[PDB]
Amino acid sequence: ELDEVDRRILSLLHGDARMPNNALADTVGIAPSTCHGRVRRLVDLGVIRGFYTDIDPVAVGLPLQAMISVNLQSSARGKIRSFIQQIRRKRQVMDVYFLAGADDFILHVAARDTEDLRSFVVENLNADADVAGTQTSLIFEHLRGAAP
Amino acid sequence: RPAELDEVDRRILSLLHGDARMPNNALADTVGIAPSTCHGRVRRLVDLGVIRGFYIDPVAVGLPLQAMISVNLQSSARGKIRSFIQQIRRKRQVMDVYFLAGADDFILHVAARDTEDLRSFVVENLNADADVAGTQTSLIFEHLRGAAP
């Protein structure tokens, strides 16, 4: 469902997320109106999940990062879609990964201190119907600099 | 390095976190400073490394199969970890790199078109190098948090 114009738009935006629409529309060889509409369409269809700024090692000021693999009870599995929803709304949570392995999902989280992390685990995980969790320390995370 | 950020820098980072495409004029107006001053401040933030970059097109548009590959290096190869990633990041399939403190040295969030592509990534970029082993696992869904930063 992607035409080559959308492909050029996506490639250029991948390389320059901050690219002004005039320059983008000109580089693609389209009109600014049509370019903006195409991009809005792309965001709407979920083709672009969003545009983001990669802020710091999170050290300013969430220096403590973690990966929490969560296993739910067998009866609670039916509620999985809901569980993620409410939990995505939580401050500390940045990413959610669903895997095809032993764990139901993994939570990539950021916290201020050990007390903040512990607070997240206790209030959001330990106080619910989920079997268990394994928290492992994140030392650094990096995006990837590869062109499309 | 925290604490070398004023309320203006804070407002800038907060506004720019979710909306990387917020125009400089709109940003400066919302923060209540002149656009020139704002540009200097954003440039400042990028320079300090406080802003690592601006980037999220899905993946199913060419790479419908996603994986998480946990890598364990040799005890002798560990010292060069910084270099390893420094190369592995440039590889087309890798989306994320996490350094961990568990048994495995790091985990790689990657995207590939098919299982053969994934297998090729592991063989040619990992298996044919000085790293002890890898465990490649399937990703079914990926999410970011819809929380107001």
- Domain ranges, ordered by start, for chain B: 8-56, 57-139
| Closest chain B residue to the Cα of A87, Cα to Cα | B145
Place of tokens 């609670």: A76
The experimental method is: X-ray
Backbone φ and ψ for A126, nearest 5 degrees, come out as -55, -30
The number of beta carbons lying within 10 Å of the beta carbon of residue A3 is 9
Looking at the structure, give the CATH architecture of the domain made up of residues A5-54.
Orthogonal Bundle (1.10)
Nearest to A88 among B52, B107, B147 (CB): B147
Chain length of chain B: 149
Q: What is the resolution of this structure in A?
A: 3.0
Best of B17, B59, B144 to mutate (most A CBs within 10 Å, chain A): B144
Chain-chain contact of A49 with B145 (C-beta, under 8 angstroms): no
Are the C-beta atoms of residues A70 and A77 closer than 8 Å to each other?
no
Cα–Cα distance, A56 to A71 (Å, whole number): 30
Residue type for position B96: D
Chain-chain contact of A13 with B57 (C-beta, under 8 angstroms): yes
Question: In this structure, which CATH number among 1.10.150.20, 3.40.50.300, 3.40.800.10, 1.10.10.10 belongs to the domain B8-56?
Answer: 1.10.10.10
Q: Does the fold of domain B57-139 match that of domain B8-56? A: no
Residues of A whose CB is below 8 A from B97: 141-144
DSSP summary character for residue B33: S
The highest-level CATH class for domain A55-138 is alpha beta
CA angle B124, B127, B131 (to 5 degrees): 125
Cα–Cα distance, A112 to A63 (Å, whole number): 6
Structure tokens belonging to residue A22: 């005039």
Place of tokens 């994986």: B67
Structure tokens belonging to residue B96: 């994320």
> Can you name the CATH fold of B57-139?
Alpha-Beta Plaits (3.30.70)
The shortest C-alpha distance from B141 to chain A (Å) reads 5
Are the C-beta atoms of residues B107 and B71 closer than 8 Å to each other?
yes
Nearest to A17 among B55, B85, B143 (CB): B55
Determine the straight-line distance between the first and last CA of chain B, rounded to whole angstroms. 19
Backbone φ and ψ for A87, nearest 5 degrees, come out as -80, -25
